[PDB]
Each structure stands twice: as C-alpha cells, then as structure tokens.
Amino acid sequence: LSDFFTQLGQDAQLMEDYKQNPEAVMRAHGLTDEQINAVMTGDMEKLKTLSGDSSYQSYLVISHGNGD
Amino acid sequence: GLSDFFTQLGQDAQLMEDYKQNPEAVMRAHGLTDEQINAVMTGDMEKLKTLSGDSSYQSYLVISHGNGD
Amino acid sequence: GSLVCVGTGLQLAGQISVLSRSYIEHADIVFSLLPDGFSQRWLTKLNPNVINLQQFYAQNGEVKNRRDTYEQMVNAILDAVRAGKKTVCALYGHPGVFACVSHMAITRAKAEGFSAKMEPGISAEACLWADLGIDPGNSGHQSFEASQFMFFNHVPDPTTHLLLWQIAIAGEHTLTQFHTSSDRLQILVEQLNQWYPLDHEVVIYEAANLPIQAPRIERLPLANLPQAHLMPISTLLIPPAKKLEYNYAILAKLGIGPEDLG
Amino acid sequence: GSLVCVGTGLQLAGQISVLSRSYIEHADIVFSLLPDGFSQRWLTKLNPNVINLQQFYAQNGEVKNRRDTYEQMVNAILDAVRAGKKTVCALYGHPGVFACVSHMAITRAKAEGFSAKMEPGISAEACLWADLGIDPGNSGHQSFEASQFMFFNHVPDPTTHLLLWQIAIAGEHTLTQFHTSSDRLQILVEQLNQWYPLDHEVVIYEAANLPIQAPRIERLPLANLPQAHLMPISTLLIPPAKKLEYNYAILAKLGIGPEDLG
Numbered sequence: 001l002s003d004f005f006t007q008l009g010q011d012a013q014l015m016e017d018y019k020q021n022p023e024a025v026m027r028a029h030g031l032t033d034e035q036i037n038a039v040m041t042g043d044m045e046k047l048k049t050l051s052g053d054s055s056y057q058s059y060l061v062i063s064h065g066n067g068d
Numbered sequence: 069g070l071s072d073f074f075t076q077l078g079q080d081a082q083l084m085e086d087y088k089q090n091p092e093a094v095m096r097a098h099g100l101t102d103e104q105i106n107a108v109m110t111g112d113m114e115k116l117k118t119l120s121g122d123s124s125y126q127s128y129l130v131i132s133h134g135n136g137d
Numbered sequence: 138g139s140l141v142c143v144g145t146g147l148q149l150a151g152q153i154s155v156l157s158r159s160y161i162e163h164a165d166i167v168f169s170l171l172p173d174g175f176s177q178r179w180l181t182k183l184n185p186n187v188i189n190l191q192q193f194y195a196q197n198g199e200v201k202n203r204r205d206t207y208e209q210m211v212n213a214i215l216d217a218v219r220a221g222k223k224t225v226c227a228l229y230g231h232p233g234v235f236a237c238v239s240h241m242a243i244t245r246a247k248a249e250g251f252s253a254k255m256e257p258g259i260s261a262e263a264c265l266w267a268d269l270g271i272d273p274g275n276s277g278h279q280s281f282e283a284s285q286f287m288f289f290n291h292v293p294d295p296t297t298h299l300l301l302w303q304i305a306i307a308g309e310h311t312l313t314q315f316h317t318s319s320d321r322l323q324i325l326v327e328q329l330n331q332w333y334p335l336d337h338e339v340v341i342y343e344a345a346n347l348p349i350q351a352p353r354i355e356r357l358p359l360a361n362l363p364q365a366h367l368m369p370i371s372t373l374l375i376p377p378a379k380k381l382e383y384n385y386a387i388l389a390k391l392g393i394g395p396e397d398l399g
Numbered sequence: 400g401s402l403v404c405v406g407t408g409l410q411l412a413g414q415i416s417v418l419s420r421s422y423i424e425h426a427d428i429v430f431s432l433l434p435d436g437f438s439q440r441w442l443t444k445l446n447p448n449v450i451n452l453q454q455f456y457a458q459n460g461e462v463k464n465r466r467d468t469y470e471q472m473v474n475a476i477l478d479a480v481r482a483g484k485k486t487v488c489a490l491y492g493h494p495g496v497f498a499c500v501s502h503m504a505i506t507r508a509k510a511e512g513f514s515a516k517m518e519p520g521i522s523a524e525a526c527l528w529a530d531l532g533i534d535p536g537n538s539g540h541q542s543f544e545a546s547q548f549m550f551f552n553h554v555p556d557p558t559t560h561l562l563l564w565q566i567a568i569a570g571e572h573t574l575t576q577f578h579t580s581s582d583r584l585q586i587l588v589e590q591l592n593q594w595y596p597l598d599h600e601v602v603i604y605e606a607a608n609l610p611i612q613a614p615r616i617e618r619l620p621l622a623n624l625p626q627a628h629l630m631p632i633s634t635l636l637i638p639p640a641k642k643l644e645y646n647y648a649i650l651a652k653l654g655i656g657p658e659d660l661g
C-alpha cells in the first residue's frame with residue numbers, strides 16, 4: 001500500500017495511467033480487493049488500518065487565535 | 069557554465085550549504101569569471117543575464133488584471 | 138549547528154519542492170509534523186534520523202495548553218541545533234502558514250547566533266485555489282484564524298473569497314480541546330450574519346493527503362454549519378456575498394469612468 | 400489530448416514540486432511563462448518541446464490590450480489539446496494565483512470535453528511569508544490586485560497583513576501600458592490614507608529568481624511610494640496599522656472574557 005501510494009504520488013506517468021484505469025493499475029500493483037474497495041469508497045480510516053498505522057494518532061493544529 | 073552552476077545550486081542542498089559557507093570559493097571552483105562573481109556580489113541581475121547570453125530575453129510577467137471580467 | 142524549516146505540501150511524496158527534499162535528505166536530524174503514517178514512512182525512508190513532533194500534543198485525555206505543546210516543539214528543535222546538528226524541521230504544507238513553531242524556532246535560533254531560514258511550501262490555501270478553480274486575485278482574498286475572528290475585531294470585505302482556518306476549533310478559548318461545540322459554531326453563524334445571509338452557500342474544504350483520495354468540497358448554506366461534520370484539517374471558504382462595484386470616487390481622481398477601463 | 404497546469408515557483412529549478420517536474424518531463428508539449436533565460440534553459444533541458452507564451456505580450460511598442468494577450472495564450476494552449484497532445488502549461492509560481500490563463504484554459508478544456516486540472520505551486524506570497532518571517536494567521540491576511548483596489552470598492556482590515564499585487568501598474572486603466580505613473584501612485588497613497596498614516600512603514604518585496612540572489616525587502620514610509628523604484632514583479636506589503644482589539648459582543652455570547660483566553 002505505502003510503496004504504491006509513494007510511487008503514484010511522485011510519478012506523473014503512473015498518475016496518468018491510474019486516472020485512465022484505477023482498478024487495473026491498483027491490481028497491477030498487487031492491491032487486495034478490500035484495499036481497492038477502501039479506495040473507491042474513499043474510506044481513508046480503513047486504508048490506514050490495512051497499511052499498519054491508524055494506531056498512529058495525528059493532530060495537525062500548529063497555531064492559535066488568542067494572540068501573544 | 070553560468071547556467072549549469074545556477075541550475076545545480078538551485079536543486080542541491082549539499083551544494084547550497086557549501087555555497088552559503090564560502091560563496092566566492094564555490095563560484096571560482098565552478099568556473100565563474102571575476103566579472104560574473106562581481107555581478108553576483110553586487111546583486112546586478114541585469115549584467116548576469118548579459119554574461120549568460122541574454123540575446124534580449126525580454127520577460128513581462130503580469131498574467132492578470134483588475135478591471136473585472 | 139543550523140536550522141532549515143521546510144514544508145512537505147499536503148499530498149504524499151510529490152508535493153515537496155525538489156530543493157526541500159534535498160534539505161531533508163542531507164539533514165543530520167529531522168523534526169517532523171506530517172499528516173499520516175504513509176507520509177511518516179516516506180520521510181523515514183528519505184532520512185531515518187527523525188523525531189516526531191506529534192508526541193508533544195496532549196496524550197490520553199490530558200489537559201494541555203497548546204502554547205506549552207508549541208514551546209516544547211521549539212525547544213526540542215533548538216536542542217538539536219545547540220548540540221551542533223544540521224537540523225531540518227519538516228512541517229506539512231508551508232512551514233510558516235498558520236504555524237508558529239518554525240517562525241518561533243527561527244527567531245530563537247538567530248537570537249542564539251545560529252544560521253536559520255525557512256523554505257516556502259505548498260499550503261492548504263494553495264491546494265484550494267487549484268481544487269476549486271478560484272483565483273485569489275479575481276475579487277480579492279482574506280484569511281483569518283476562526284477563533285481570532287470570534288475573539289477580536291476583524292471586518293471582512295464581502296466582495297472577497299474569505300477563508301476561516303481551524304474552523305473545527307472556532308471559539309475553543311482554553312486551547313486544551315481538540316474540537317469546538319455546535320453552540321459555538323451557531324454563535325459564529327450569527328456573527329457572520331452581519332455580512333452574509335443565513336442561506337449564503339459556504340464550502341467546507343479538505344485537500345487530499347493521498348494520491349488515490351479526492352478532496353472534500355462540501356457546499357451547504359451558512360445556517361447548516363453548526364450541524365456539519367468538521368475535522369481539524371477542515372477549512373471554511375465563504376465566497377463573495379456582493380459583486381464588485383465601481384469606485385466612482387477614485388475614478389473621478391484618475392479623471393476616468395467605467396467606460397474607459399480596458 | 401489533455402491539459403495539466405503546473406507552477407515552477409519563483410526560484411530556478413529547485414522550487415517546483417517533485418510531481419510537477421514529472422508532469423513537465425512526460426508532456427508531449429509545454430506552454431511556458433517563466434521569469435528569465437536561466438529558467439527557460441532549465442525547462443528546455445527537461446522537455447525540448449516548448450512554446451514560449453511570452454511571445455503574445457505587446458512587442459516593439461505596439462498598443463495591445465492584455466485581455467487579447469491572455470485570450471491568445473489560452474487559444475494557443477487549447478489548440479495543442481484539441482490536436483490530441485498531452486499538454487502542460489508551466490507558469491512561474493502557482494499557476495492559478497493572480498493568473499487568469501490557467502483557470503480560463505481549464506474551464507475551456509472541460510467545456511470542450513478534455514481532461515484538465517491544475518497542480519498547486521509555491522507563489523510569490525508563499526515566498527514573502529518565509530523571507531519576512533511573517534505568518535498570515537498571526538493577525539490575518541488580505542490580498543488585492545492594486546488596480547482593482549482603486550477601480551472597485553474594497554475595504555481593508557487594518558489589523559491584517561495587506562498585500563497589493565501588481566503595484567507597478569496601479570491605476571493603469573487601459574491594460575496597454577507596462578507601468579503606471581507617480582501621479583497614479585500618489586492617488587493610491589491618498590486612498591490608502593483612509594486607514595494608514597502617511598508615515599506608515601510599508602515594504603516593497605521581490606522574491607529572488609536565482610539561488611545567488613537575495614530578495615528585495617525595501618522599507619519606506621507609505622508617503623514615499625510614488626517616488627519608489629517598482630518593477631512588474633514588485634508586491635507592496637502593508638503591515639497592520641492597529642493592534643487586535645477584544646470583540647466584547649461575541650466574548651459575552653460565549654460567556655467569557657480576555658482573562659479566560661488560554
């Protein structure tokens with residue numbers, strides 16, 4: 001999962017291949033049926049469980065509006 | 069020469085930090101002339117474009133207006 | 138030692154600048170604040186010497202002022218620079234956009250006699266213009282932190298695209314909770330009603346962090362904001378309430394009229 | 400055929416996204432609008448099949464409405480897409496920040512039934528926050544095109560960092576000249592004097608395009624703007640004239656006061 005996503009996010013040729021036929025590209029890179037279903041339903045929580053890190057809690061607020 | 073150095077320095081964090089420590093030494097070693105180094109140290113971007121081979125690359129960069137659609 | 142703060146962008150692996158990636162690659166040590174585990178994995182393959190800044194956020198239901206979180210983040214970064222390490226701080230998006238930690242670390246590092254600089258990155262706002270196909274220049278742009286808009290006197294120009302950032306914590310005054318409440322967002326709605334009708338279409342926007350993920354672009358009337366599902370990464374876009382109208386006063390000083398505009 | 404609009408950022412070679420560089424690399428053809436000859440050389444090495452959009456600007460002192468320039472740019476891009484080319488438009492900075500050509504091309508391509516998308520990039524504003532060590536969230540941010548600020552009704556919040564873009568053509572109503580006049584800038588000063596004192600320190604900012612180049616960060620009183628040296632790339636930064644003041648009305652509805660703020 002992590003290997004595919006990292007390649008796909010950097011490589012414009014693989015990105016254009018993905019956009020033409022997402023299911024064919026995900027299967028060619030070994031993604032399971034439930035991984036593909038997670039992608040097509042947009043379940044980002046499920047993909048995080050299947051990769052290994054939804055135990056990884058992530059809070060992303062790095063500023064406040066109270067001044068000083 | 070001038071172009072190849074700038075393209076490398078712009079992308080390579082190791083060369084960028086070498087350049088920051090000793091700008092003249094790094095520029096001499098990559099073959100920049102005394103006049104090219106002087107243009108850099110005085111911030112004369114006009115002269116640097118001449119020494120590169122400008123051939124009048126005129127570059128107007130406004131791609132919008134404020135007159136409404 | 139030395140400090141370079143960089144941004145990784147919102148998207149996994151591909152939205153970092155070529156130079157910024159190089160800075161991470163060659164760093165003695167990296168202090169990270171990234172969106173997810175895929176991004177964390179990608180960083181650790183680039184440079185294994187990583188300290189996750191995520192640890193400094195309140196853990197297991199503790200009460201912690203975010204001011205203390207950020208102080209601890211800045212101190213952690215500076216301890217590596219003071220030791221002599223070529224230090225990189227790798228924050229998601231742009232390291233200096235609605236992020237105090239990099240600015241504070243750079244100010245503190247310069248004051249203690251260390252080389253420190255920030256490299257710009259692609260922010261969530263940069264992703265919004267792309268995703269929604271909106272140009273900030275079209276009728277102007279304003280950005281405010283949602284809680285700062287509630288606590289202090291800010292006046293929006295309703296001809297602009299207005300962004301309220303950190304909308305998920307709007308009105309959360311203690312800096313100890315991870316989200317606000319429906320009653321706080323209803324007070325924001327009533328406050329915005331000074332300039333925007335209750336039926337005015339607003340957009341809850343979330344830029345994607347993965348290449349297989351679509352952005353969130355949820356259109357709803359302003360009145361329905363308090364019932365909406367919000368996440369810490371949610372930005373509220375409030376498109377213009379009014380069209381642009383001629384400044385006859387200034388046209389008169391320029392000695393022209395609207396018919397004269399190109 | 401298909402369209403992808405990307406940005407190259409402001410700095411030569413290093414300030415493009417990893418993915419955006421890959422899009423240029425693999426393109427059938429690239430339509431470019433880059434800052435200088437170094438950047439043009441760099442692009443031509445990446446992909447030799449380049450059409451320079453610079454050619455559509457007024458040449459040799461001709462009188463040409465920029466609206467016609469921009470229409471011709473969009474038409475040139477769409478002619479490649481219609482022919483069946485995998486087409487990339489590579490603009491400097493962010494391709495959709497104060498840039499109509501990419502948004503227009505994408506709109507037109509989608510309407511003609513072609514794949515079109517915009518990849519975000521690092522804008523001159525993203526450069527400004529880093530180079531000045533200013534966070535747009537600290538007291539908020541507003542951006543206007545300078546001429547639009549003069550011609551239409553816009554009201555700045557003077558607690559914010561205010562950016563006037565394309566200051567160098569402020570008030571140039573024809574869209575046929577490359578720069579404005581000091582008299583037009585003096586009218587802009589008087590207009591701004593509704594909120595900012597004449598002795599208010601403003602900043603003329605120019606992000607560097609080369610790695611050996613320092614940014615321009617020129618501090619001067621607002622009064623001196625009309626005599627200042629401006630270039631087309633100059634952005635006017637107007638820092639806050641007033642500190643943030645407590646919004647007692649909203650605080651009371653929240654049932655809190657200043658002393659309760661974390």
Ligand SMILES: Nc1ncnc2c1ncn2[C@@H]1O[C@H](CSCC[C@H](N)C(=O)O)[C@@H](O)[C@H]1O
Nearest residue numbers: 230231234235260261302303343344370372
């Ligand atoms: N994925 C995302 N989509 C939209 N907005 C986001 C986002 N991630 C962060 N933000 C915005 O940023 C706020 C945190 S402040 C950090 C912003 C970050 N430096 C950047 O460059 O984007 C969030 O509350 C939200 O308003």
Ligand SMILES: Nc1ncnc2c1ncn2[C@@H]1O[C@H](CSCC[C@H](N)C(=O)O)[C@@H](O)[C@H]1O
Nearest residue numbers: 492493496497522523564565605606632634
């Ligand atoms: N080097 C630079 N430094 C500062 N502002 C710049 C700049 N290059 C362009 N700009 C600003 O952008 C305006 C042109 S509009 C195009 C902006 C570009 N898409 C970007 O993302 O930055 C200029 O008039 C100026 O206000």
